[PDB]
């Protein structure tokens, strides 16, 4: 049961907002914005397929995040002559995931960069 | 001490290759120039600046990354395994040129930090060993 | 003639629009908008530059639908073993055409997709 | 029966290829390949199964599409020839690689729809004979 | 000390403008805006994070014109065959440098093209 | 005589090639075709309506771009000193293929218009000796 703005699909409640900001700070938001609040989650091709008109529908062509942040920080990262990786020099600190509004397709940004969004949550 | 063409430093040989390969090609051009001898691991801040000094003292192209040893290990597109609503990530779409779990040097940052790029590039590397 | 908010080019009026319709809703909502309305029908490359420019004007950065569909669907699809077509699995029944505001370049996109548009109507 | 790497499926036999061509090149691989063989037909639902099973069971990454041999005979951008405000199709300005009259599996639909991609990528692939 | 709106990034300000002009007009138009006031220039990349993060902020998904124009109208074209360059033909007579909100990726248009844009002045 | 499959056109000798290679190469092949061969030099307006004429009636494929031989010689990204505010360019960050610092024809313009394009496309050419 959606409140009159958000968008319902299987059971869940989605919104998309305008306001870019970094992944962290749209994640925090979708909280406060309501009970169980969170960003994006996309469990099956459908739900991707509906939250990525939805998006388009409401804000047109743009990229929004979802709710997946720092992809490969916790990956195995080797250097191929296996010397234990120590000294670190990453430009970027973390990637996260998000989704641009003309497919369903999954893309990379740096976190602490901009981008709009779209929260979800369950009832 | 090196062969001829290969810079030292601190115990190593460095050579940098303007060639435009993929990383797993990249590394394979390293491999059969020693047995040891590997795509690039920079280790100190010292070996960060010589690698550096190195590219922009050698390379006549300075528009692309040049690969360095550090990669993800596994067939891997991400490793968080939960959306942050708790949910195990079990479906995903990814487009491969975005699983981003190689590493570069490039201009923009003086070739002191590494970039996250993917591994199917055609850049110029260095090599060590 | 060129009502409020309809540009004029070459004795044809053009209106973008901003409501994201598939194709086959778009070019509906062109045919009951005017009398001989329908969806963009470029025949020169200035023509399509007016449009472009006019997309770009008034939407900005977005993707617009052309009035081109079925693109392929009734093309000469042949095995390379030259097996006999029966069995048909598409994914997508369909594509349209459309273009970016960026350029006047044609670009393909399965028609029950979201797309933004523009009309077009004679006199 | 067959010849080895291939695999057998009602009276015909079945390779893939992790050789990432393009679809010209591909369907030359499959002629060079076999006795007059060629890039996969599906020609009923079971072949269809019978086709993903194989690109999952014997690829490394299924993350691309991979060409099967359906393809528009005969050079065209577009086969409609008239807009929606019945005018003849004229002017055309097509980006070549926007016109997708090539068709692949892709790992989104289970490698059981066709897909419509450009043909002058360079995927993975599967032969028949 | 910028004006009610322009954001501030050492000692500049710095404001970008939704009506799409081509880069004459949009550099014009910066200069009418305030004394020194020009399209807006990298000269670091943490200004151009800066910029493209304050686009991104203020108007989404879009290109925007960087202060660079007719650059390659100065450079040494020659025919590989020595011959003259009398005769010209060229599709468009001049290119401008822009960038996308996405990222501080330098890019080219033609200059005739509309585009958004960033103004730039000091103090 | 011009070299076989070459036409001539006011004393010299013009030919399409449908291989698609870079400029630079385009340019190589033209000069390994004949003495003094280079990639067309379009002096005047006959010529242009004569190669545009040469390459509609001669190519199978007529949606690339087709190189002529003007371009900017050598590693140039953009020549304009300074921006428009008085200070001089030094941080650049341009994408490679964003330079379009070579000249091309294109369909769209009848062949008759030079159109800024990526050095390193691969685009079919016509020679000139
Ligand atoms: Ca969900
Ligand atoms: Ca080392
Ligand atoms: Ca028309
Ligand atoms: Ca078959
Ligand atoms: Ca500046
Ligand atoms: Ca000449």
Same mark, same amino acid.
């Given at each position: 049961d959606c409140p009159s703005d958000w968008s319902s699909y299987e059971g869940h409640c989605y919104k998309p907002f305008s306001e870019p900001k970094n992944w962290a700070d749209a994640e925090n938001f979708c909280t406060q914005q309501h009970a169980g609040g969170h960003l994006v989650s996309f469990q099956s091709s459908e739900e991707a397929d509906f939250v990525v008109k939805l998006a388009f529908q409401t804000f047109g062509h743009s990229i929004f995040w979802m709710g997946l942040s720092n992809?490969?920080?916790?990956?195995?990262?080797?250097?191929?002559?296996?010397?234990?990786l120590r000294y670190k020099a990453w430009a970027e600190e973390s990637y996260c995931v998000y989704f641009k509004s003309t497919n369903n397709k999954w893309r990379?940004?740096?976190?602490?960069?901009?981008?709009?969004?779209?929260?979800?949550?369950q009832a | 001490d090196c062969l001829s063409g290969w810079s030292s430093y601190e115990g190593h040989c460095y050579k940098a290759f303007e060639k435009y390969k993929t990383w797993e090609?990249? $590394?394979?051009?390293?491999?059969?120039?020693?047995?040891?001898?590997?795509?690039?691991?920079?280790?100190?801040?010292? $070996?960060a600046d010589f690698v550096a000094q190195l590219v922009t003292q050698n390379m006549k192209r300075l528009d692309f990354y040049i690969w360095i040893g550090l990669r993800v290990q596994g067939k891997v597109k991400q490793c968080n395994s939960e959306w942050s609503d708790g949910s195990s990530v079990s479906y995903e779409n990814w487009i491969e040129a975005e699983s981003?779990?190689?590493?570069?040097? $490039?201009? $923009?940052?003086?070739?002191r930090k590494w970039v996250n790029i993917?591994?199917?590039?055609?850049?110029?590397?260095?090599?060590?060993?």
């Open positions: 992809v490969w920080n916790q990956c195995n990262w080797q250097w191929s002559n296996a010397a234990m990379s940004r740096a976190c602490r960069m901009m981008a709009q969004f779209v929260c979800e949550f | 090609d990249a $590394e394979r051009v390293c491999t059969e120039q020693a047995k040891g001898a590997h795509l690039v691991s920079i280790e100190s801040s010292g $070996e981003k779990t190689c590493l570069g040097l $490039e201009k $923009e940052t003086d070739f993917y591994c199917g590039q055609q850049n110029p590397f260095v090599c060590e060993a």
